Design a protein around this ligand. Structure first.
Ligand SMILES: NC(=O)c1ccc[n+]([C@@H]2O[C@H](COP(=O)([O-])OP(=O)(O)OC[C@H]3O[C@@H](n4cnc5c(N)ncnc54)[C@H](OP(=O)(O)O)[C@@H]3O)[C@@H](O)[C@H]2O)c1
Ligand SMILES: O=C(O)COc1cc(Cl)ccc1C(=O)NCc1ccc(Br)cc1F
Length: 316
């Protein structure tokens, strides 16, 4: 299994990265240091995660120590929903760059296809709990992302949580200058995403799978929810291969030509999760894991469901 996938901007992206959503600020510096020490070269970040400064301390220390060169790292961040305005995109990107201690990002994503009212609050609400939209559409936001490439702030741009029709809207944009390089979407055996993945791959867009372990630490988890890590059938495939369930769950998307970004702040799990280049799931294993699809999503949010661009009404 080759470690990197070629993007449509001509750059190579490591297929395994470290996720950072929910990584506590007092733990994420060590997590990222350990990750880089054990071989990770891709870190998935976002301003809304509120820990980019601490991620950046780790990146900078490892660059200073000459554990890695900047060109060997692939750092991803995301434009939050309250910065879908022309006049706000550059400053949002620059704040992320300053926090991460970087002079460019390898990839910058529109985090959700959904613009909110700008201001201090990440989820501005009306008095009845609906998110307050921005009138700023995904095409105008995309043009602002293209400008970041042309200013040298980012090497690649992409999208996240865009449905089929929204990806198509970008591809069909009048005057489109740069195609999205990546669409980062939730994907795991309970949400297998065959339709959207095939569409994106057919257009040369690389798909990154988020929440590949089913996000057991998501703050809205309920006791009744299905659990990938505890699913005895997945455990059975893992046992057959003498690997952990998490390792199977990480290798699965890799064999679909996806990038995958498991999160951990536990050093032993960070290392575990990287040890996925030395075994292969059979085709039968792959089809069996695909068969577990239930259309079950970690990431959805009631307060945003009436926004005109909320992505999960549409089928794929
Ligand atoms: N674009 C978006 O909208 C979006 C949305 C969601 C996620 N993401 C990105 O994708 C990343 C991954 O998704 P996620 O954070 O939702 O969840 P995840 O990676 O599916 O699961 C993370 C959870 O699994 C645990 N874990 C990690 N390795 C394990 C192992 N080997 N054995 C047992 N448990 C293990 C972690 O615990 P410990 O940390 O305590 O070890 C944590 O509780 C995020 O951090 C973020 O970077 C992006
Ligand atoms: O969005 C992510 O990356 C992970 O989920 C969250 C992370 C943070 Cl720090 C805060 C909140 C979420 C979170 O609630 N994400 C879900 C979400 C968000 C926005 C929209 Br328009 C739809 C939607 F389903």
């Amino acid at each position: 299994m080759a470690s990197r996938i070629l993007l449509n901007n001509g750059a190579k992206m490591p297929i395994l990265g470290l996720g950072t959503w929910k990584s506590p600020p007092g733990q994420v510096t060590e997590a990222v240091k350990v990750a880089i020490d054990v071989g990770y070269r891709h870190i998935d970040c976002a301003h809304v995660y509120q820990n980019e400064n601490e991620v950046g301390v780790a990146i900078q220390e490892k660059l200073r120590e000459q554990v890695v060169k900047r060109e060997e790292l692939f750092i991803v961040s995301k434009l939050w929903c309250t910065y879908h305005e022309k006049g706000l995109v550059k400053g949002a990107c620059q704040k992320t760059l300053s926090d991460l201690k970087l002079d460019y990002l390898d990839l910058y994503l529109i985090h959700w296809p959904v613009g909110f009212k700008p201001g201090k609050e990440f989820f501005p609400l009306d008095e009845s709990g609906n998110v307050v939209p921005s009138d700023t559409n995904i095409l105008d936001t995309w043009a602002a992302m293209e400008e970041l490439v042309d200013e040298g702030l980012v090497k690649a741009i992409g999208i996240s949580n865009f449905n089929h029709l929204q990806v198509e809207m970008i591809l069909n944009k009048p005057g489109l200058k740069y195609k999205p390089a990546v669409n980062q979407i939730e994907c795991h055996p309970y949400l297998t995403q065959e339709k959207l993945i095939q569409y994106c791959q057919s257009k040369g867009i690389v798909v990154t799978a988020y929440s590949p372990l089913g996000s057991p630490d998501r703050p809205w988890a309920k006791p009744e929810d299905p659990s990938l890590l505890e699913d005895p059938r997945i455990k059975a495939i893992a046992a057959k291969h003498n690997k952990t369930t998490a390792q199977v769950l990480i290798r699965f998307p890799m064999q679909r030509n996806l990038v995958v970004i498991p999160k951990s702040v536990t050093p032993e799990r960070i290392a575990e999760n990287f040890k996925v280049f030395d075994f292969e799931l059979s085709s039968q294993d792959m089809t069996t894991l695909l068969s577990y699809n239930r259309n079950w999503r970690v990431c959805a949010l009631l307060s945003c469901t009436s926004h005109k661009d909320y992505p999960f009404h549409e089928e794929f």
